[PDB]
Structure formats: C-alpha cells, structure tokens
Amino acid sequence: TGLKSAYKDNFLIGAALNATIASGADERLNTLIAKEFNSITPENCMKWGVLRDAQGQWNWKDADAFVAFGTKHNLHMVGHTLVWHSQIHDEVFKNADGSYISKAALQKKMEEHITTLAGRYKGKLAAWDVVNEAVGDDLKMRDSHWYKIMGDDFIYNAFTLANEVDPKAHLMYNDYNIERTGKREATVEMIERLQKRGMPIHGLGIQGHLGIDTPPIAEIEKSIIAFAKLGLRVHFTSLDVDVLPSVWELPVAEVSTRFEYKPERDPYTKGLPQEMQDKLAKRYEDLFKLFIKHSDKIDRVTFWGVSDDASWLNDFSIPGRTNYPLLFDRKLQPKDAYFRLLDLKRLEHH
Ligand SMILES: OC[C@@H]1O[C@@H](O[C@@H]2[C@@H](O)[C@H](O[C@@H]3CO[C@H](O)[C@H](O)[C@H]3O)OC[C@H]2O)[C@H](O)[C@H]1O
Ligand SMILES: [Cl-]
Ligand SMILES: [Cl-]
Ligand SMILES: [Mg+2]
C-alpha cells in the first residue's frame, strides 16, 4: 500500500497542501494523498495575513476548503499557525506612521484572532502550531514585532489562549534549524522557562527543511531526544531535502549576490541525474532509519509538499530554481527515495 500504512505503527505520514490541492479538484492528488498520507497541514491558508486582509477582515474559502478535504478523506489535520512573524500584515503591529501599538491592544488582536481561528475549527483540527519560529538565528529570541511589543508573553499568551479555545487540541511549538546545536539549546531553554510558567504545550515541531548532506543524522538525533525529554511529543513538520547548491555558507562579499538567480546555482533544470536520485534516496533513508529508531518519541513526519513541481524550495531560497526535495516527482510518480522507505518497513525484522 502507501507510506501511511507502511508507518502505521510508527507515526502519521503527512503532507502540506497548497490551496489548489485542498480544493479537491485534482483527482490524481486525491487518489495519491488518500493512499499515502493520513495527516495534512495547510501550506499557506490559515496564516494570519493570507486568511485576513490588512483591515482584519476574514475570508474563509481556502481555510474552509482545506478542513472539508481532511474531513472528506478522514485525515489528521494540523492548524498552521496562530502566531508567527511571517505572512502577517504590519498593520497588526504598527500604526500607519510606523509606531507600535500598546501591548494591551496587540493582546486584544491576539485574543480575537486565536478565539476566531482555533474556535472555528475546535475539534476538527487535531493539532495547532501555536507559535512558529520564535528563536532568532543568532540564538536569541527573534526580534519580531510580536517579541518587541510583548516579550515572552506573546508565546505564553498564545498557548494559554489556544488551549482555552480547543482544550482537546495538541499544541505545538514549531521551528527550523532546531536540528542544530546552539538553536536547539536556546529553544529547549525557551520551552523550559515557559513550562515553568505553566504554559500549556504538548508537542514540539521540528520543521526538517534539510539539505542533501547537512545537518548530519547525529545532530537531528540529539534534538529528537532533547525535546522529548521536555515531556513533549515530537513531530517532523515541514520535511523536505534541498538538493541544490547552497547559498547558506557563502563568502562575505556575497550575502546577496547570493539570492540572485544564477545559472550554476540551478544545475538540474534538464532533470535530476541518476547519481543524485541516489544521494536523495540514501539521505531520505538515513532520515527515516532515524525516525523509526525514535518513533516512541515522534508522533508524525509531514512533508512540506506532495510533489517536486509544488515545492516551495523551487523559489526559496533563490526564485525559479528546479529543486527535487520530495517523494513524488513533477509527474506524481514516486522517486527512488520512496521505495527505499517502503522497503525499510516492508523488510523490517521482529
Ligand atoms: O514557490 C512559491 C510559493 O512558496 C510556497 O508557499 C510558501 C510556503 O511553503 C512557505 O511555508 C513555510 C516554510 O517554512 C516553514 O516550514 C514555515 O513554517 C512554513 O510556513 O511559506 C511561505 C510561502 O511563500 C507555495 O508553494 C508558493 O506560494
Ligand atoms: Cl497555498
Ligand atoms: Cl546532470
Ligand atoms: Mg473531524
């Protein structure tokens, strides 16, 4: 059968779904999703600034279509995300003159947003990313407007609110590069200090935006262990593997430059050679060996897309590259990495 049944006894197999896919209108992705995944996450549609215009006004079409889809196919559904510094309008934070509104006023906007959003899907969504990406890459609390107006209380109040709205909801914190030493620890710290405040939190999302070579598997492992120790369920939430030239490690004189589209940084436009098909299978296989090792700690592994043609890495971090990060190709056909992963479970020894 599919991924989901292969991994039934391990964890949920999930896909982020764009709004075209959430519409139901692609029978070929319906057939695929129904076979392969049992968990879905809205890739964009339940984000503050996508869901609401700059005046706080709500359009629920896509948000509603996504919940109709998972109800329809009976898939576990993750809300993404109540409180985040990205894809949210500056009018949330700032007067037209640039100045920041009071904390009190922003609290009120947060109350309303969580109350309406979690409230509306209370009991339909099993899980929420309540706060997304609150630790800076300099390993300090990210200097978002959330943070600058509110402090730790934006995260605190966000969870407490969420939990009051849907008591039943599994409530996560979600971040990227927390596979990595340094930011892993600053996040463990962050949870700890809020958990001693009594903040209701149930899960820790590891985004899992990985590269073909890095981070190493020992890294990821340390993080699975650190976070579960905080008495939380571990999720891999935005899984994909970047197979393109990295701009992450570039010399000074090229901080951008580095985001500009350049030929050589897009080397596989004519197709992914077999030699890299293979590095990608092997890298997915290492990851999933790891995940199986620790499936007492991991509740779910979600991919940040269904197929390559629809991966966000085609445009991040350089617009318009041809990447190959996911299990299904641009023709919806499964890739070498896919069979390696069925095989792990198929041939498993007990
Ligand atoms: O390719 C163009 C564009 O990218 C995609 O939407 C993007 C989302 O996938 C992206 O998701 C975040 C990835 O980082 C973290 O996991 C974070 O938690 C996610 O929200 O968000 C930015 C979007 O531009 C679409 O495929 C398409 O619109
Ligand atoms: Cl979308
Ligand atoms: Cl090639
Ligand atoms: Mg339901």
Count how many Cα atoms sit within 13 Å of the Cα of residue 297 in the half-sphere of its side chain: 21
Report the alpha-carbon distance of residue 331 to residue 323 in Å, rounded: 14
Report the alpha-carbon distance of residue 220 to residue 141 in Å, rounded: 21
Those residues whose C-beta lies under 8 Å from the C-beta of residue 24, and which sit 6 or more positions away, are: 30, 65, 68, 69, 72
DSSP result, 179-219: TSTTHHHHHHHHHHHHHTTT----EEEE--EEESS-S-HHH
What is the best residue among 174, 206, 312 to mutate for testing ligand 1's pocket, by most ligand atoms within 8 Å of CB? 312
CATH for 113? 3.20.20.80
Burial 305-335 (b: 16+ CB within 10 A, else e): bbbbebbbbbeebbeebbbbbbbbbeebebb
Torsion of CA 209, 215, 219, 221, to 10 degrees: 50
- Interhelix angle 217-228/274-293, rounded to 10 degrees, is 30
Count how many Cα atoms sit within 13 Å of the Cα of residue 4 in the half-sphere of its side chain: 17
What is the best residue among 44, 142, 173 to mutate for testing ligand 1's pocket, by most ligand atoms within 8 Å of CB? 44
Which letter does DSSP use for residue 134 in this model? -
Instruction: Find the residues whose C-beta lies inside 6 A of ligand 1.
Output: 18, 43-44, 132, 174, 176, 207, 238, 304, 312, 314-315
| Residue 195 structural domain | 1-350
Amino acid code (one letter) for 303 = F
For the chain, how many structural domains are there in total? 1
Query: Å resolution of this model?
Result: 2.4
Q: Whose CA is nearest to atom 24 of ligand 1?
A: 312
Ligand 1 closest atom vs CA 316: 1
Q: Ligand 2 centroid to 89 CA: how many Å?
A: 17
- Beta carbons of 241 and 277 less than 8 angstroms apart: no
Compute how many other C-beta atoms are within 10 angstroms of the C-beta atom of residue 130. Answer: 29
Compute how many other C-beta atoms are within 10 angstroms of the C-beta atom of residue 57. Answer: 8
Over the Cα atoms of the chain, what is R_g? 20
Compute how many other C-beta atoms are within 10 angstroms of the C-beta atom of residue 119. Answer: 11
**Which ligand is nearest the CA of 68, by number?**
4
Which of 239, 245, 244, 141 is CA-nearest to residue 194? 141
Instruction: For residue 122, list its beta bridge partners.
Output: 125
Residues with beta carbon < 5 A to ion ligand 3? 273
**Which ligand is nearest the CA of 72, by number?**
4
- The structure tokens listed for 166 are 């849907």
Q: Whose CA is nearest to atom 22 of ligand 1?
A: 44
Residue 236: in which H helix or E strand, if any? strand 233-242
Report the alpha-carbon distance of residue 229 to residue 222 in Å, rounded: 11
**Which ligand is nearest the CA of 45, by number?**
2
